[PDB]
């Protein structure tokens, strides 16, 4: 059986930065491999034939190669919409054709601050006896989003699931949620609640404040 | 001129050989250690060499080794179904060997190819060498490769750096008729002093 | 154009039997040869089978004895039956479809079953809406949340689908309640926000549930 490792687990590169991606073979194939395209959440995509043959309706800025057992890709001009993860597959022969690790590959445009913004439980919430503190970094990127919520000004961390996004093409940057899943009572009882936010696009760490006052 | 013929034919262009009215010698098979694998169906390859034929017919072809164990009755080959089907009752035996050596070339040679489409299997023992484009649907090719438009064969390439599971191997496959006919091949063991 | 139909399955125990489909709106399906996808969820996908078209059979290690896959030429149509599920087995799972032996041209958006020990259970939606003077974004941020919902996913649309391309949205996660929930995202200037109103629709396959909630400012006149 052929076993595959595809170099590296993750990637940066900027605007038309030249983005080149390897997968290794463990056994000699000759041209019974296929580069694929596949966004999150989103179908796998041809990309090649062969190794060098194009395919129909992709810009020539897609590039490939790679023979024996070391396989390449390569990107000529680097463009927002490929953000995405690459992966391999194998021609006929066995079915499970495994390959290497994940890989995030990241564009690089700007830095910008995170924006914050917040909501307020709802009434059936609060008859529901979980207020939802909503926060919501969007627009930011690096995704080194430091994300603090002391309530009154004091921390209490604990019980909140939060859910991050990929980079949006049309910004180029990530967006982060959290929500907390506590009882109302102390809601009402807090007056004032913070949320302190730390990235490379503030100078200092910044924090916001949002009083009880609004709903 | 079978076993050491210096070139073969391609899989979808399969060769048909006729032997009658001449002696087998069997032991030269299957006593010389030179052949990858030798099976034999519902027959004894040693035990050949005292029993008639009616004719005797042998085939040969060049695939790749792992395919080869997909030539069996009750069995679907992916170029076996679309190359040379075999009946579930045949009778007869199965000999292949390598030939990375003859048939791999270092910048590949290409000159080999094999059918890759129809719409329903051979039957057995039937070739297919029409080189009409195949229609992928509803629209025709009208003779124009493209889109849904893919010429019937394509070819096989083959390099000394292919790995074991890569490399090609040279097959000859042995098939006996018995008809209600007086028998044509003869073995030449009983000869003494 | 070139899209596949795909059945759509459900919430199954373990060494459940049922039957699926998919249908080729591209080309006839005898003209060309198809198959199905296995996705395990963030690992990868696997080849599992495929019919040829002298109605050959090939299956994968894992589906011999567990699925069986057919066709109707006539309504263009490639099925697909299941027996002795496993939990493991939720998935999401596409179709494949091979104009050549080499490759894949089109995929299916693909059908989940789930195999566990949680059962269907009907929604709870609670709405949410800022105030439209606080709209520091010439397009605001929005909330409606459809939680303890089982299973995922959920169909998106807003109005009728319209109103999409500024729309935004967060992925639904199974919930500490051992449920899933998610919410939504419109985008409509800031201005309309101070009167205008707008709906969420919802389409729940595996909980059979239909939610549409308006977007009723406070009136923060007042
Ligand atoms: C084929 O030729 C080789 C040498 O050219 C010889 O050793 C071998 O015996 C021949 N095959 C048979 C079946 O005699």
Redesign the interface.
Known sequence: AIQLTQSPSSLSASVGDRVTITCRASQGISTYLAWYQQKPGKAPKLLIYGASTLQSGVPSRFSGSGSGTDFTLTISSLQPEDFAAYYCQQVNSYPPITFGPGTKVDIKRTVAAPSVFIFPPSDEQLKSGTASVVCLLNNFYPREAKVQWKVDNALQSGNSQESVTEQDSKDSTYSLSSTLTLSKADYEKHKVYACEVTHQGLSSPVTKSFNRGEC | EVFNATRFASVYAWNRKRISNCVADYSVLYNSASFSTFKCYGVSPTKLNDLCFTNVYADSFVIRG?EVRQIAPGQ?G?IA?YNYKLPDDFTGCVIAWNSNNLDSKVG?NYNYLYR?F????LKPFERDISTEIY????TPCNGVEG??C?FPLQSY???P???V??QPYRVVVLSFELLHAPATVCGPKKSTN | EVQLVESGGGLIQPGGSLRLSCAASGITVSSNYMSWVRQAPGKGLEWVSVIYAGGSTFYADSVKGRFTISRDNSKNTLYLQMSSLRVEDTAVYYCARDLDYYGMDVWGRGTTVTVSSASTKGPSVFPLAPSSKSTSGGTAALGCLVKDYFPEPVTVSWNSGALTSGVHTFPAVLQSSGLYSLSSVVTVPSSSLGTQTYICNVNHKPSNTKVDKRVEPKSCDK
């Open positions: 792992d679907t992916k179904d590949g890759l129809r719409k329903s299997n229609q992928a649907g509803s889109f849904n893919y390439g083959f390099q750096t292919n790995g599971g890569y």
